């Protein structure tokens, strides 16, 4: 009789460690969430489903299988037998299928460019749908589990046991099956997170954000009307309100041919002889030939077809008094942060990212396709260019720096959630490899260490627990409003605060 194995005191130990930190870190989460109406965010009520998930498998399915891998033996009977199985992959489902549906909301959000946001009530019924669907693709697994009896004895048997097993009628089934359960459960809804949450990092941290110690006001000397002018003198034109735009020249995105048209709008107006344009870019040469033909017919308009360093273009942003962004298609908005960053007021079509930044306090919007709309818009700048500007000039960089900080915030959420998926990946890996060596691949048949084997199977059922209880360890290390509400627990139960 094999009896004892060597990892049982680790086995025990790890399972209730993890079935204790499992169940306060997810109940804790469910609080956090319900006792601050702050933290109901869409994320977060998906967070609260995985977080009952969690609770759900940590209590009905960690102790049978615990006593089963220390055992090799099935204690609960028949029902239990078909229940438990079933519950744990109801649970798997549940969890791969809220991850999914949480970076799909955070791609909405984030890569769309209407950028999606969820209500409360439509995350609700999709947590509803997600159970439902797994309710129902698992119905299998409740059918094909089977106790089976076993009588060990040489004639007379004197002694039995039962083990919980699946029951295949067939080579082809089981195979069908586990592969399907491996790309419902796992590879799936993998792929679908990695290459969502690649775009989403590409947004966030590479096309989006602003050198922040770059393009700031310190690096300037004397006051801006002392700045502008020496501009202006350096660049041969008269004092004036400066109207600045830099970008490429193109038909149908930045919007170089719209303003070059709003100019020839303005240039029959008295209005114009005010204003000052420096056009700053390169591209189309029959945009370019366009530009030039009216810097030569009007003193007012300079052309910059060079190259300027990024210390050059700060002077600008830092000497202008608006900048003119008309672009068609504007993502990210590099320019409006820059811009603002460094006081000059934006105009700029109501366009994708251009359309976040500025607020009816912070810059001058215009329909993105329409040259009379631009001309208006300038024409409104020379208003209030006549009056003090510095009240705006202030509100712009305030804005900015708050964007900043929100671009700031959405990256920690972001990071979280790459790393809940990361140790997703990562806990389920060696049990997502066993199962399908074991019932695709037929391996493990022939027992020649069947004790390496199960040794294996052990370690990777726990480490498919300990997910449960990494989940809430990541919020409190890489969240702070999870953070203080987990530690608003700590001191309600132990302290007895109730803040
Ligand atoms: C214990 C445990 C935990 C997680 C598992 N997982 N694999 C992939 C994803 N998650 C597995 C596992 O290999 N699964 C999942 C469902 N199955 C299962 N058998 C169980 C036995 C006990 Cl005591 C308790 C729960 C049980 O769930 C039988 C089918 C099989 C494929 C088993
Ligand atoms: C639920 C569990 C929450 C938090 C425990 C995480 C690990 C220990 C954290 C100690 C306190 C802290 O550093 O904030
Ligand atoms: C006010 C109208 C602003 C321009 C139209 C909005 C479209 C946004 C976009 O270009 O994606
Ligand atoms: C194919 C699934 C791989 C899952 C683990 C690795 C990726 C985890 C999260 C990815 C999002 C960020 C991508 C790189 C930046
Ligand atoms: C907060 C008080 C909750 C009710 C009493 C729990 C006592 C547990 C303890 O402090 O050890
Ligand atoms: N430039
Ligand atoms: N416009």
Known sequence: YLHPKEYAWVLIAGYIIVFVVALIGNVLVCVAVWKNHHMRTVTNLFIVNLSLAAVLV???????????????????????????????????????????????????????????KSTAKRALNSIVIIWIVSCIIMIPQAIVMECSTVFPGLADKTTAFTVCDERWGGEIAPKMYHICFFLVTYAAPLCLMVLLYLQIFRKLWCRQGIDCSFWNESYLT????????????????????????????????????????????????????????????????????????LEEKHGNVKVITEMLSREFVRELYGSVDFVIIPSYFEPFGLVALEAMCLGAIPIASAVGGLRDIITNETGILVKAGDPGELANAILKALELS???????????????????????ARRKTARMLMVVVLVFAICYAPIS???????????????????????????????????????????????????????????????????
């Not at 489902?93 to 991850?99: G, R």
């Not at 501009?231 to 735009?245: A, C, H, I, P």
């Not at 006549?386 to 929100?406: G, I, V």
């Not at 260490?449 to 498919?464: G, I, K, Q």
């Open 386 to 408: 006549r009056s003090d500007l510095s009240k705006f000039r202030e509100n712009c960089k305030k804005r900015a720096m708050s964007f900043s900080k929100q671009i700031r």
């Open 433 to 499: 490899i066993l199962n399908v060596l074991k019932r695709v691949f037929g391996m493990f048949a022939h027992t020649e260490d069947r004790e390496t084997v199960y040794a294996w199977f052990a370690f990777s059922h726990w480490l498919v627990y300990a997910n449960s209880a990494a989940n809430p360890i990541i919020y409190n290390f890489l969240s702070g409003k999870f953070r203080e509400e987990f530690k608003a627990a700590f001191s309600w139960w132990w302290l007895g605060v109730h803040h």
């Open 222 to 293: 004397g006051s801006r009307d002392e700045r502008k002018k020496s501009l202006l003198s350096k660049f041969g034109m008269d004092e004036g309100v400066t109207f600045m735009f830099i970008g490429r020249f193109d038909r149908g995105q930045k919007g170089v041919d719209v303003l070059l048209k709003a100019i020839e709008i303005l240039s029959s107006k008295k209005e114009f002889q005010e204003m000052r344009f420096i056009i700053i870019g390169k591209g189309d040469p029959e945009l370019e030939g366009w530009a030039r033909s």
């Open 58 to 116: 940590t209590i009905t399915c960690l102790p049978a299988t615990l006593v089963v891998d220390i055992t090799e033996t099935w204690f609960f009977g028949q029902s239990l037998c078909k229940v438990i199985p079933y519950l744990q992959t109801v649970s798997v489902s549940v969890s791969a299928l809220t991850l999914s549906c949480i970076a799909l909301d955070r791609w909405y959000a984030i890569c769309h460019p209407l950028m999606f």
